[PDB]
Amino acid sequence: TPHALLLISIDGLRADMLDRGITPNLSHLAREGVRARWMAPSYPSLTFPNHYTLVTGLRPDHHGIVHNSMRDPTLGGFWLSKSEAVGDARWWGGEPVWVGVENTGQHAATWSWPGSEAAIKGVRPSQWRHYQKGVRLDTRVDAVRGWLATDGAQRNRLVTLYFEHVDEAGADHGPESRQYADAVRAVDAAIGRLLAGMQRDGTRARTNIIVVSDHGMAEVAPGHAISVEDIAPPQIATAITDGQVIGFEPLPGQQAAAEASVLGAHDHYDCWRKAELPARWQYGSHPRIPSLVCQMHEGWDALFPDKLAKRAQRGTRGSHGYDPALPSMRAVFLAQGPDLAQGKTLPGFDNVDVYALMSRLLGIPAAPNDGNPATLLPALRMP
Ligand SMILES: [Zn+2]
């Protein structure tokens, strides 16, 4: 029979965090279900590009959400809080799973998944919301609980759930901090209450569940921040993004200065013309990508000079956006329910492979994607 699918993201949950005895509910779920050793993000290892990859099966270079902050010659500027860029379907390539679900005449309900605020290929989820900071754990958990309990023609085949809490604590104090651990416990306990609730609604047993994160987290120790203008001064190029994936557009008639001073290897970063980026990143062909892309080494940030003055307090902090082959960047994948195996472990794999699993659990035809449809067949009860 057709079963519902609950898709949960715990933003910035690193893969080793399942094995520290701070996720009793997730650990139990994995033991009853399937667990990957880890799941690698796509390049760049950032929140928006990876949440969108997860639901499309496409690499960021194909789906168009190539950074958290971008420019396009036609659509203008995009960043996470410009709601009318985020809510504009023209940024978002491919076909996310909720579109596919709606196009079968079934219903999708999304708690704040990146892209779910837009009418992608003209199609919205049945239930959704604009992202709001500070929404309570038990608020979103009860909404999702209700969307899963919904009967009749309003029945949801797909429900998605997002938590920011782990990522926020990690950004502030680093991934080895007690604040990061507390946020993990808290999100884990929230999921426990969700599961218990589903047991009481009688929705648990007919619901498949996938829990993922978008990327992991690396520690950024005091003094590990430079200015983007140390990479290329404003005389020669414009920094389009800061953080860890630093995009530059040289000034007109400054190619040579830009390329002579920026390209290649430096103390704590490396830079490439976008077309010449490391092949395994599968990134650099999209026109929205700045002509020059620099990658900061793990544990280092390059910041706009105004931020650099503001922050420089002290305090261990945390960042993602590093090389997706780094252990620190590893995300989680686990799954459990009536159509998923039990007590199974899977090898490490790339996050573009989740899409094909979800298509099959949702009874939708899989759109074309960058994933390998074989990788997650073993997660199924019956391949
Ligand atoms: Zn994130």
Residue numbers in the entry: 44 to 426
What does the literature reporting this entry say, word for word?
Since ENPP1 is part of the highly conserved nucleotide pyrophosphatase/phosphodiesterase (NPP) protein family, we investigated the evolutionary conservation of the analogous histidine residue and its requirement for cGAMP degradation. Two zinc ions are required for NPP’s catalytic activity, with Zn1 being particularly important for stabilizing the leaving group, whereas Zn2 activates the threonine nucleophile. We found that Xac NPP not only degrades cyclic dinucleotides but also prefers 2′-5′–linked over 3′-5′–linked cyclic dinucleotides. Furthermore, the conserved histidine is required for degrading the 2′-5′ but not 3′-5′ phosphodiester linkage.
Since the histidine (H362 in mouse ENPP1 and H214 in Xac NPP) is one of three residues that chelates Zn1, we hypothesized that the loss of the histidine prevents Zn1 binding. Indeed, in contrast to Xac NPPWT, which binds two zincs, our 2.0 Å crystal structure revealed that Xac NPPH214A was missing Zn1. We found that Xac NPPWT degrades ATP and that Xac NPPH214A (which corresponds to the mouse H362A mutation) degrades ATP several-fold faster than NPPWT, suggesting that H214 is not conserved for the purpose of scavenging base products from ATP. Indeed, Xac NPPWT degrades the metazoan 2′3′-cGAMP while the NPPH214A mutant does not, mirroring our findings with mouse ENPP1H362A. Interestingly, H214 is required to cleave cyclic dinucleotides with 2′-5′ linkages (2′3′-cGAMP, 3′2′-cGAMP, 2′3′-CDA, 2′3′-CDG), but is not required for cyclic dinucleotides with only 3′-5′ linkages (3′3′-cGAMP, 3′3-CDA, or 3′3-CDG). We also docked 3′3′-cGAMP and 2′3′-cGAMP into our H214A Xac NPP structure. Similar to ATP, the free 2′-OH group in 3′3′-cGAMP can also take the place of the missing histidine to chelate Zn1 while the free 3′-OH group in 2′3′-cGAMP is too far away from Zn1. We propose that ATP and 3′-5′–linked cyclic dinucleotides are able to compensate for the loss of histidine with their γ-phosphate oxygen and 2′-OH group, respectively, explaining why H362 in mouse ENPP1 and H214 in Xac NPP are only required for cleaving 2′-5′–linked phosphodiester bonds.
